[PDB]
């Protein structure tokens, strides 16, 4: 319901950046960088949910999902 107080602690909003390689083909996998956006403390053992990676033309060129590796 729209009127409800949700105070989460295990969820962080993140921005995902990636590089589209030359001659990229569908089904191929690429590395991504995940960066927190606001007042989050750590992303040590987090998991990235389904994220569509848009280009400059605002079209989906890849889908991102996996486990983050943070140095610590």
């Amino acid at each position: 319901p729209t009127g409800t107080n949700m105070q989460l602690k295990n969820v962080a909003a993140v921005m995902v950046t990636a590089s589209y390689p030359p001659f990229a083909r569908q089904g191929q996998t690429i590395d991504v960088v995940v960066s927190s956006m606001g007042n989050a403390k750590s992303l040590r053992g987090g998991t990235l949910l389904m994220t569509p990676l848009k280009g400059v033309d605002s079209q989906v060129y890849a889908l991102a999902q996996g486990n983050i590796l943070v140095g610590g």
């Binding site: 400059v56 033309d57 605002s58 079209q59």
Partner: protein, 58 residues
């Protein structure tokens, strides 16, 4: 494809067919006034109630 779209720039109309919100707020008020006046009053009198004899002829 809708072409290149800036990420952080404010959404502005750029091409033919783009929409824009106009907030109509007009408040115009002009006024002018003027006046002029002129007046003139003049009264004059002279009376000889009692005339001495040597002045009678005058």
């Amino acid at each position: 494809n809708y072409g290149y779209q800036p990420l952080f720039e404010d959404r502005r109309p750029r091409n033919i067919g783009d929409t824009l919100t106009i907030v109509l707020q007009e408040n115009v008020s002009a006024s002018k006034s003027s006046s002029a006046n002129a007046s003139r009053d003049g009264k004059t009198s002279f009376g000889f109630d009692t005339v001495p004899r040597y002045l009678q002829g005058l």
